[PDB]
Amino acid sequence: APKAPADGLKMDKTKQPVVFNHSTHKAVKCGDCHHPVNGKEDYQKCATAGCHDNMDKKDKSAKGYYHAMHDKGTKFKSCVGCHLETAGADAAKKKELTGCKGSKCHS
Numbered sequence: 001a002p003k004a005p006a007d008g009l010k011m012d013k014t015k016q017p018v019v020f021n022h023s024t025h026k027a028v029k030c031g032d033c034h035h036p037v038n039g040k041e042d043y044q045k046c047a048t049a050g051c052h053d054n055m056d057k058k059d060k061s062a063k064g065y066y067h068a069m070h071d072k073g074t075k076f077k078s079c080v081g082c083h084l085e086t087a088g089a090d091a092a093k094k095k096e097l098t099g100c101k102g103s104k105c106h107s
């Protein structure tokens, strides 16, 4: 069975890189992020060719990498989508978890 990697993973496909820590996401099943593709949970890097490899941040199709990390109403939760739900009405948590700058994702 796949094992989570070490904390401090840098997502760095863009000029706004973001650190991801598995240890803070244990309340989330692995396959909610490493989601099924052709019926099997896929543990490849999200931006693998044929996956979320479109680096046009304006693309709203499934292959758009920005879209996959930021948008609501997606088939699997995005980073920002799930964080918005988590923050609820708490403005401090909305800033920490969903702010576009000065958040835990982007400085």
Ligand code: HEM
Pocket (backbone or CB within 6 Å): 002, 003, 004, 005, 009, 010, 011, 020, 022, 025, 026, 028, 029, 030, 031, 032, 033, 034, 043, 044, 045, 046, 047
């Ligand atoms: C569940 C305990 C779980 C496992 C297992 C797991 C594994 C895993 C691997 C093996 C990697 C490395 C991939 C590589 O080859 O680079 C990896 C990377 C990322 N993960 Fe993960 N992961 C588990 C859980 C979760 C959860 C719950 C989320 C989403 C909240 C998540 C996300 C990520 C992300 C993002 C990465 C980086 C991918 C990248 O493209 O570099 N994982 N995980």
Ligand code: HEM
Pocket (backbone or CB within 6 Å): 033, 034, 035, 037, 042, 043, 044, 045, 046, 047, 048, 050, 051, 052, 060, 061, 062, 067, 068, 069, 073, 074, 075, 076, 077, 078
């Ligand atoms: C990496 C951990 C990773 C993330 C994060 C992720 C997210 C993601 C979202 C949010 C969606 C929904 C988009 C929408 O509804 O518009 C989505 C959908 C698909 N993904 Fe993905 N995804 C990650 C990893 C991977 C990998 C490694 C591949 C390629 C093997 C891949 C592919 C796809 C496909 C295909 C879809 C659409 C699925 C369907 O319609 O059932 N993703 N992903």
Ligand code: HEM
Pocket (backbone or CB within 6 Å): 018, 019, 020, 021, 024, 025, 027, 028, 032, 033, 069, 077, 078, 079, 080, 082, 083, 086, 093, 097, 104, 105
């Ligand atoms: C998507 C790849 C993604 C990123 C990036 C991400 C980041 C992130 C950070 C930076 C934190 C703060 C703690 C830390 O420094 O590790 C954090 C915390 C929470 N997250 Fe997250 N997160 C990503 C995705 C997801 C997904 C898809 C969910 C829900 C399904 C989720 C949830 C949470 C929760 C819960 C926390 C803790 C919140 C807190 O108040 O402490 N994240 N994540």
Ligand code: HEM
Pocket (backbone or CB within 6 Å): 011, 012, 013, 014, 015, 016, 017, 018, 055, 056, 057, 066, 069, 070, 079, 080, 083, 097, 098, 099, 100, 101, 103, 104, 105, 106
């Ligand atoms: C707030 C809604 C918000 C904005 C706006 C935003 C912007 C942003 C940009 C411009 C990029 C780079 C896109 C490109 O291709 O040039 C980027 C990248 C990532 N972001 Fe973001 N972002 C906002 C908020 C958040 C939050 C709160 C998280 C974490 C939950 C987050 C995550 C990510 C991830 C992951 C990336 C990709 C990192 C990489 O691979 O380089 N964003 N964002």
